[PDB]
Amino acid sequence: LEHFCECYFNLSGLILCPVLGSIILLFIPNSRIRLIRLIGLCASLITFLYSLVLWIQFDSSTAKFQFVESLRWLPYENINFYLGIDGISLFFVILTTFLIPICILVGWSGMRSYGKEYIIAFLICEFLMIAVFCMLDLLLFYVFFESVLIPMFIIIGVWGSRQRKIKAAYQFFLYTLLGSLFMLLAILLILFQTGTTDLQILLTTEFSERRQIFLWIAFFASFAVKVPMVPVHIWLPEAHVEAPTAGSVILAGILLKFGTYGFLRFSIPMFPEATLCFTPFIYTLSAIAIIYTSLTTLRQIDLKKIIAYSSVAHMNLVTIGMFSLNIQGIGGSILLMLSHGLVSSALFLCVGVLYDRHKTRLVRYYGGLVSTMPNFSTIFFFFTLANMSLPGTSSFIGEFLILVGAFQRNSLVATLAALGMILGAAYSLWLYNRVVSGNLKPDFLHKFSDLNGREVFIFIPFLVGLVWMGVYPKVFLDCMHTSVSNLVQHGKFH
Amino acid sequence: GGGMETNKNKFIEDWGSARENLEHNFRWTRRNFALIGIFGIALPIIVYKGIVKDFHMQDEDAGRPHRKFL
Amino acid sequence: PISATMVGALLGLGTQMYSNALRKLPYMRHPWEHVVGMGLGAVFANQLVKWDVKLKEDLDVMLAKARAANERRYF
Amino acid sequence: KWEDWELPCYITSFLTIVILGVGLNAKPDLSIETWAHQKALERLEMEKLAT
Amino acid sequence: GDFRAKVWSMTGGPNCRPKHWRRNTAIAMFGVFLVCIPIAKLSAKLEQRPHMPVRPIPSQIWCKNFGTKDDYEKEH
Amino acid sequence: MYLLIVFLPLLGSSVAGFFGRFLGSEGSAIMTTTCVSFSSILSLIAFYEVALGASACYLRIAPWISSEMFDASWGFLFDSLTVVMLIVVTFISSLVHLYSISYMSEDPHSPRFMCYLSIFTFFMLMLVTGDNFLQLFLGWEGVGLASYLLIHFWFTRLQADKAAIKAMLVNRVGDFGLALGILGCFTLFQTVDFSTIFACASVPRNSWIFCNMRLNAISLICILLFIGAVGKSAQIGLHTWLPDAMEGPTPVSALIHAATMVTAGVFMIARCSPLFEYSPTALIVITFAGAMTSFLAATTGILQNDLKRVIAYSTCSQLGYMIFACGISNYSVSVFHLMNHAFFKALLFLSAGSVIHAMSDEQDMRKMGGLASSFPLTYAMMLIGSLSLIGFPFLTGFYSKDVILELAYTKYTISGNFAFWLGSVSVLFTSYYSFRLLFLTFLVPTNSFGRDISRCHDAPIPMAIPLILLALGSLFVGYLAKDMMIGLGTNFWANSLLVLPKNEILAESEFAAPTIIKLIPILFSTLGAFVAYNVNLVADQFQRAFQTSTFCNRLYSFFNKRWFFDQVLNDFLVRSFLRFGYEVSFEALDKGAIEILGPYGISYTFRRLAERISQLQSGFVYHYAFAMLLGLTLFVTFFCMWDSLSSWVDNRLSFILIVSSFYTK
Amino acid sequence: GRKKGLPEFEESAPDGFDPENPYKDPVAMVEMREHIVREKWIQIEKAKILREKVKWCYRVEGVNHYQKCRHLVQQYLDSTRGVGWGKDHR
Amino acid sequence: PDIYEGSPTPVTAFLSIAPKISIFANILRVFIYGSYGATLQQIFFFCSIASMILGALAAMAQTKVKRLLAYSSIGHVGYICIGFSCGTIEGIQSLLIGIFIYALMTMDAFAIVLALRQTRVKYIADLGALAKTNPILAITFSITMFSYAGIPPLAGFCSKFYLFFAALGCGAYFLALVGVVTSVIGCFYYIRLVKRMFFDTPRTWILYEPMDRNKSLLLAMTSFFITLFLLYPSPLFSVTHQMALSLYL
Amino acid sequence: VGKHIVPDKPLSVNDELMADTVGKYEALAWLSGGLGFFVGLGLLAVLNDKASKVPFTPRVYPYDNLRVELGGEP
Amino acid sequence: GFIMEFAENLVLRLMENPEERDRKAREHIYEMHERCKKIKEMWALPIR
Structure with a gap:
């Protein structure tokens, strides 16, 4: 059944753009560095504009999948795959298309040593990440998710700063592969029952409570590694710290979102009965991760480790929201996911600004920076506040909505989750003050440069996006509520 | 005198590397056994039962039976 | 549109460039070989499409016979 | 001298505001909230004038 | 001090004494007053005073929303 | 005009912050003062039209968070309570801007200081004018931020950085409770709008499940909200931050931690009186908190040697008086004390700063004295402020402090009796x-250094003008505003405050009280003045008690070190959590058991397994033939000779032994 | 292309929906799920319209809101019990 | 492993592919066609499990390229024989598909090995800094290693996919667990080569002579197959289904 | 400010984070006594029972204690 | 002429038709649910 779309801008062209960029960049000699830079940046920017147009034609009254286009695999047509988005995946496509040009711009100065391999790796990552978010099939979702492991492994290992990147890349690859292997088993068990992997059909098929429980456990084994939930989160600090800056931006801003996206797209709607049974279990794991990892963050001494550990606590608050199973909880969970991809990405950009100049991540060396880099200090303070979920910032909207949705279900989990307001404030301000405030230490650092024109421009869309969501989240919530409402109602008829 | 890179301190870097390599120091002592038992096992079970009990107390407030959980 | 001939020609041209690159030669060393590779790739892609069509017919005949043999059980 | 990234980035920045500034304010309001508001107004009208 | 003279900042750094600070201060005055004009117009448009004041008040000169929410069983 | 009230200080701060490099010290000083002062004038007009003209203003800009029934909005509410707080905030801030103009003249970074002053003012306005709980929360957090930025405004000083972090962490605990109450409010009433909640508050009677306990929903919400007022208004439990907040510049102490922000907790209890009125349990809790705080800050402040510390503890004591006044259902009296307090306390901090500026930044009272004739203006303002603070008859402080102590006596409840004794x-x-x-400071024979005395000077005009205006306030505001605020049967508050009929005690407090009760404060104040004269002008062997007696020495340190509250909370609470994040969650779990039962242990065991399996390929052809023969024998044995063996063997045992073979030698 | 105007939906529940075995007509199952979501959103807007009434009665009547808005508060509080996806099921 | 190492490398390449095709044809026509039944398939089930586990561990222990390839082939025959164990039409089809893909991948790998044997490659560490000295060869070899590891959408996934399909089809979860663990181990020792060629910074580099035209053309074709087979897999599926059916009819 | 001390001795753990005259548990005992003063004072307030010596009768409001004016049934 | 009215039409021209989009979604489900039986016969064909 050729369910092709009538719109002019569709998902296939968006998936094809960065692929064309990579193919063209395959054949350009490494002496034409200017041309390589320009072509990569332009391909990413056109992809961003294309995704913005997809936003423009979005229809916010339907709970159906929009811009659905079919892609055929066999002329037998037994196995035929569909692409489409709804209010739950649209903004994540947008976020991917926006973060990739940032990743290219961050490594602009070193592009004479990075080479076309760096741009091609990021453009290939873009294609797979956009595709993952646009899949209406369990099997294609699985296959595209693992494809990102190859370029992410390459990015971490080749362009990481020090040789701990070896261990980091190994751990990342092995943990993620294990998780994806448990998902494969569940996909093949689903396919044994239903004879299909088409998501829309699965949303209309009934599962037994026993097999719902079991298949939910099989999905959890992958998603909890992706989120990450305790105690399988220890790969994250190594991988996100040893990666290059743009690698950290992609890892924390997009790849982390895949486990929570998988909870919203597959487990929660497809197995409603099992989801209710495991709700105290998810509540306990998330609450422990929020309290415990926030306290570990307090005692970290590496700049990138503090930011990496903060990401774990923010993502477990997201899981409390999505498993609250109401408009505020799921609505807040998606907004926090988007906000985190901007705030943590900006924070990894601040640390990279410091590291590119002085080549150290230890907090003890820094301090006093407000007297030499006031521009960086002001930008760093703003994203420090956004990381504390200050009202008026994008992160406060998602945070409070999740707490609202949790309070209406279980007042205890909402209380433990609200403890991150105290803990998250403690490590964010302690980090900012030890780096920016105080006096300089000329025996460690004596030569300083504030942000240049490229770094300031890089920070601009992050400030605008954070403010825009923090003061007027209605432009996002309006386009989501119809898909959110039907996700909550899935499996009940009263 | 030369460059923006930090002038490394051997004592501060040693403190940094000893932090990264903590897993080589774990020994399975008495204190660790108490700490892992209390905060790795006992406390999560306490939080789990508190959350279940919170749901159950709601069930008997609504005149409903105790909802089953895995 | 995207015919087999164009995919095969592109694949053959890419095969000649890949070969030259694996041997540290300029991508366009011996361009007449790039033309030859385009032709051979086009021919190979079209023949693969025809062979796939033929294979499907043969499989259908084989599957018909297998199902007849299996339905004989309930006689 | 402008660096090579400035022009593509300042054109993307300009097009971003124009698309979102115009497109978001020109796309029709199709939220479930706006449709239900109108629907709920008529049902409260229809149960008030009728008993 | 010595190196802070080479450091750019939005607030001007230490002991900022711009030579033309008076014309810049007066130009800054005008910008705020020009910014205030649309704010005041929007404020006057948005205010809601459900109660007539005991005596005439300066906001009756520009605000036309006095004694309007009397029909409250119609608000939606 | 009402939007210009809130957003003018934002405009003033925006120009100084973004464009302070073009205006300099003088330009940024004029810019932020003019915008705040204009907003102050409009606030006077708003007080005339809303309070005097009885015409409330409602203004709704746009929705903020609209998610199903969640309806946080950018909306403003201007009623009688609002315009009282507008007057207090805008008037005091305008004076503090004028005062800082010359107080920070020699500071290198005045433009950033003036910018921070105006951004605090904007957030405080957003706090008092909001019409829903979420906009109030935005103001609540914003003033927490601006206070942090101003306490460590001298970022090079480590004690300021320690104090600013402590101020923000203690208040986040208060915000934690405040947010929980807002969550509870929405769950019960399905709205965060102030007017809707107050209109529905009388109805709900249901019980709630909170932390595995069946509690009353209204009482739970009100106590959680009060936790928010405990943090901002420095009440017992979360109060140790207020004395340390003196690390900032003196103008910061006057505006932020004495007059405007420190009273946000009192304002919020009063603004929510239509909700708090339906939880007598919360009122009892509030009564006990305020009463204990007033005693805790009074006993502590009688041994401080630093000028700013003494006035900071005085601020914390008056707040307790305001809180337990709200607890006995007298919100008009607590707010009346609030505005009165904003006048003499601000006069006391700004007068202290002038002494400190005059004495070359000396702050220890043991190195002062004999300064009355050297600084006549400053001493005169300090006398007015002090006499008004202590409640001398017919001053501003007398018309509200005495009424609170009278009402507490009239409250014939255990918590009322508790408050009366402690107040x-x-x-x-x-x-x-x-x-x-x-x-x-000014009357004893000089205890000071000569180089300070020979460099003294008194207030310049921009510093003296606010002091004289606050003297007039700290002498006449109380008499002028009594019948307006707490006049018997007054309608000034309209619907801003709610006191239920069963809780009304003002008439009985003014008529049924014995005459001796109304004279206890003046009799108590006279005793305190006389005792102070004796200890500080006559006694000469008194200190010797502490330098020879162990119990009397610990007692001196007990009241000097604030009941060892910071200590106990540092040694038992902060250190416990700090140690947990390293020794337990990180070393024992993340880099301990999780590593051993994970990547570190898994790599080790599989490396050994690979080493052993590799050793099987020994390179000897005889071993390969032996392995083939063993495989053949195994096949024959298992797949043919397994018919009579099941008599003596089990399948479980077989696999057990194969795995157990791995732990050999 | 799309025609201008508000979205249009069927007023009535899908025909073909057996509430006894919801997983027998899937096209109707999906359409019932969408119809219930739309119906639930109508009641959500109902309570919000009713909430605007309570708000302005409090603002207009002041000290007399307890007697003058007694009826509106009852209506709002009844509409909010069992509304949307909150703390009440049906 | 000993014969694969000790033989001349072209002999090793030939012994890796052709005899397996011919012996599996024999095994099909003898066993699948004859009729003793359960025991015969249990033989191959237990030997498949032993092969997967032992191959994975022993390969993880190797430091020489040829031994690593030998042990990888042992593991993969374990995966293939899982198909013969299930004894169904899809089992035979998947066995044939696995044989075909393993043969093409092995031909790719041995083309690279024979190319590097002109500078005498012996150890995995000899491949240090190959992404600098010959970046396109390091990419081609990394593609082969990720395909060997079964990372989608490379051709190696196809065979891995079946393993779990039969494990959940013939109802065997211990087989599934063995497959998950040994797949992870294999992924580790395959990506160790990618780490050696891309992430390491050795003090001493080995510069390799460029390969001849025959091996470059064969490598280009097999690499295009490995990256792009899952886009058009219909002919192999149809032909293997034909062969599985023609075993009986 | 003047010259920041550069370490010359191996840095120990708990250095990122590193009340003089009075001991730890002794401070807890003194604070406990201070809070025990409020406890005893509160108990004394119960023992006093001021509620039992009220010198006036509870206010009575007209119109059934303003039942209609307080939101009751009209 | 007017910018916004042109943009109103331009966006309306870009959006997909709701009726056809829902129609195709319904058909997809209907056909797959009656189609889910054919292939499962093949996995059941006897090897022997």
Whole structure:
């Protein structure tokens, strides 16, 4: 059944753009560095504009999948795959298309040593990440998710700063592969029952409570590694710290979102009965991760480790929201996911600004920076506040909505989750003050440069996006509520 | 005198590397056994039962039976 | 549109460039070989499409016979 | 001298505001909230004038 | 001090004494007053005073929303 | 015009912050003062039209968070309570901007200081004018931020950085409870809008499940909200931050931690009186908190040697008086004390700063004295402020402090009796340290250094003008505003405050009270002045008690170190959590058991397994033939000779032994 | 292309929906799920319209809101019990 | 492993592919066609499990390229024989598909090995800094290693996919667990080569002579197959289904 | 400010984070006594029972204690 | 002429038709649910 779309801008062209960029960049000699830079940046920017147009034609009254286009695999047509988005995946496509040009711009100065391999790796990552978010099939979702492991492994290992990147890349690859292997088993068990992997059909098929429980456990084994939930989160600090800056931006801003996206797209709607049974279990794991990892963050001494550990606590608050199973909880969970991809990405950009100049991540060396880099200090303070979920910032909207949705279900989990307001404030301000405030230490650092024109421009869309969501989240919530409402109602008829 | 890179301190870097390599120091002592038992096992079970009990107390407030959980 | 001939020609041209690159030669060393590779790739892609069509017919005949043999059980 | 990234980035920045500034304010309001508001107004009208 | 003279900042750094600070201060005055004009117009448009004041008040000169929410069983 | 009130200080701060490099010290000083002062004038007009003209203003800009029934909005509410707080905030801030113009003249970074002053003002306005709980929360957090930025405004000083972090962390605990109450409010009433909640508050009677306990929903919400007022208004439990907040510049202490922000907790209890009125349990809790705080801050402040510390503890004592006044269902009296307090306390901090500026930044009272004739203007303003603070008859402080102590006596409840005893004794204690300050600073024979005395000067005009305006306030505001605020049967508040009929005690407090009760504060204040004169002008062997007696020495340190509250909370609470994040969650779990039962242990065991399996390929052809023969024998044995064996063997045992073979030698 | 105007939906529940075995007509199952979501959103807007009434009665009547808005508060509080996806099921 | 190492490398390449095709044809026509039944398939089930586990561990222990390839082939025959164990039409089809893909991948790998044997490659560490000295060869070899590891959408996934399909089809979860663990181990020792060629910074580099035209053309074709087979897999599926059916009819 | 001390001795753990005259548990005992003063004072307030010596009768409001004016049934 | 009215039409031209989009979604489900039986016969064909 050729369910092709009538719109002019569709998902296939968006998936094809960065692929064309990579193919063209395959054949350009490494002496034409200017041309390589320009072509990569332009391909990413056109992809961003294309995704913005997809936003423009979005229809916010339907709970159906929009811009659905079919892609055929066999002329037998037994196995035929569909692409489409709804209010739950649209903004994540947008976020991917926006973060990739940032990743290219961050490594602009070193592009004479990075080479076309760096741009091609990021453009290939873009294609797979956009595709993952646009899949209406369990099997294609699985296959595209693992494809990102190859370029992410390459990015971490080749362009990481020090040789701990070896261990980091190994751990990342092995943990993620294990998780994806448990998902494969569940996909093949689903396919044994239903004879299909088409998501829309699965949303209309009934599962037994026993097999719902079991298949939910099989999905959890992958998603909890992706989120990450305790105690399988220890790969994250190594991988996100040893990666290059743009690698950290992609890892924390997009790849982390895949486990929570998988909870919203597959487990929660497809197995409603099992989801209710495991709700105290998810509540306990998330609450422990929020309290415990926030306290570990307090005692970290590496700049990138503090930011990496903060990401774990923010993502477990997201899981409390999505498993609250109401408009505020799921609505807040998606907004926090988007906000985190901007705030943590900006924070990894601040640390990279410091590291590119002085080549150290230890907090003890820094301090006093407000007297030499006031521009960086002001930008760093703003994203420090956004990381504390200050009202008026994008992160406060998602945070409070999740707490609202949790309070209406279980007042205890909402209380433990609200403890991150105290803990998250403690490590964010302690980090900012030890780096920016105080006096300089000329025996460690004596030569300083504030942000240049490229770094300031890089920070601009992050400030605008954070403010825009923090003061007027209605432009996002309006386009989501119809898909959110039907996700909550899935499996009940009263 | 030369460059923006930090002038490394051997004592501060040693403190940094000893932090990264903590897993080589774990020994399975008495204190660790108490700490892992209390905060790795006992406390999560306490939080789990508190959350279940919170749901159950709601069930008997609504005149409903105790909802089953895995 | 995207015919087999164009995919095969592109694949053959890419095969000649890949070969030259694996041997540290300029991508366009011996361009007449790039033309030859385009032709051979086009021919190979079209023949693969025809062979796939033929294979499907043969499989259908084989599957018909297998199902007849299996339905004989309930006689 | 402008660096090579400035022009593509300042054109993307300009097009971003124009698309979102115009497109978001020109796309029709199709939220479930706006449709239900109108629907709920008529049902409260229809149960008030009728008993 | 010595190196802070080479450091750019939005607030001007230490002991900022711009030579033309008076014309810049007066130009800054005008910008705020020009910014205030649309704010005041929007404020006057948005205010809601459900109660007539005991005596005439300066906001009756520009605000036309006095004694309007009397029909409250119609608000939606 | 109402939007210009809120957003003018934002405009003033925006120009100074973004464009301070073009205006300099002088331009940024004029810019931020003019915008705040204009907003102050409009606030006077708003007080005339809303409070005097009885015409409330409602203004709704746009929705903020609209998610199903969640309806946080950018909306403003201007009623009688609002325009009282507008007057207090805008008037005091305008003076503090004028005062700082010359107080920070020699500071290198005045434009950033003036910018931070105006951004605080904007957030405080957003706090008092919001019409829903979420906009109030935005103001609540914003003033927490601006206070942090101003306490460590001298970022090079480590004690300021320690104090600013402590201020923000203690208040986040208060925000934690406040947010929980807002969550509870929405769950019960399905809205965060103030007017809707107050209109529905009388109905709900249901019980709630909170932390595995069946509790009353209204009582739970009100106590959680009060936790928010405990943090911002420095009440017992979360109060140790207020004394440390003196690390900032003196203008910061005057505006932020004495007059406007420190009273946000009192304002919020009063603004929510239509909700708090339906939880008598919360009112009892609030009564006990305020009463204990007033005693805790009074006893502590009678041994401080730093000028700013003494006035900071005085601020914390008066707040307790305001809180337990709200707890006995007298919100008009607590707000009446609030505005009165904003006048003499601000006069006391700004007068302290002038002494400090005059004495080359000396702040220890033990190195002052004999300064009355050297600084006549400053001493005169300090006398007015002090005499008004202590409740001398017919001053501003007398018309509200005495009414609270009268109402507490009239409350015939256990918590009312608790408040009366503790509020009354604190009057003796506040009179002691008020006069103790004066005698040590300006009246005793000089205890100071010569180089300071020979460099003295008195207030310049931009510093003296606010002091004279606050003297007039700290002498006449109380008399002028009594019948307006707490006049018997007054309609000034309209629907801003709610006191249920069963809780009304004002008439009985003014008529049914014995005459002796109304004279206890003046009798107590006189005793404190006389005791202060004796200890600081006559006694000469008194200190020897502490330098020879162990119990009397610990007692001196007990009241000097604030009941060892910071200590206990540092040694038992902060250190516990700090140690947990390393020794337990990180070393024992993340880099301990999880590593051993994970990547570190898994790599080790599989490396050994690979080493052993590799050793099987020994390179000897005889081993390969032996392996083939063993495989053949195994096949024959298992797949043919397994018919009579099941008599003696089990399948379980077989696999057990194969795995057990791995732990050999 | 799309025609201008508000979205249009069927007023009535899908025909073909057996509430006894919801997983027998899937096209109707999906359409019932969408119809219930739309119906639930109508009641959500109902309570919000009713909430605007309570708000302005409090603002207009002041000290007399307890007697003058007694009826509106009852209506709002009844509409909010069992509304949307909150703390009440049906 | 000993014969694969000790033989001349072209002999090793030939012994890796052709005899397996011919012996599996024999095994099909003898066993699948004859009829003793359960025992015969249990033989191959237990030997498949032993092969997967032992191959994975022993390969993880190797430091020489040829031994690593030998042990990888042992593991993969274990995966293939899982198909013969299930004894169904899809089992035979998947066995044939696995044989075909393993043969093409092995031909790719041995083309690279024979190319590097002109500078005498012996150890995995000899491949240090190959992404600098010959970046396109390091990419081609990394593609082969990720295909060997079964990372989608490379051709190696196809065979891995079946393993779990039969494990959940013939109802065997211990087989599934063995497959998950040994797949992870294999992924580790395959990506160790990618780490050696891309992430390491050795003090001493080995510069390799460029390969001849025959091996470059064969490598280009097999690499295009490995990256792009899952886009058009219909002919192999149809032909293997034909062969599985023609075993009986 | 003047010259920041550069370490010359191996840095120990708990250095990122590193009340003088009075001991730890002794401070807890003194604070406990201070809070025990409020406890005893509160108990004394119960023992006093001021509620039992009220010198006036509870206010009575007209119109059934303003039942209609307080939101009751009209 | 007017910018916004042109943009109103331009966006309306870009959006997909709701009726056809829902129609195709319904058909997809209907056909797959009656189609889910054919292939499962093949996995059941006897090897022997």
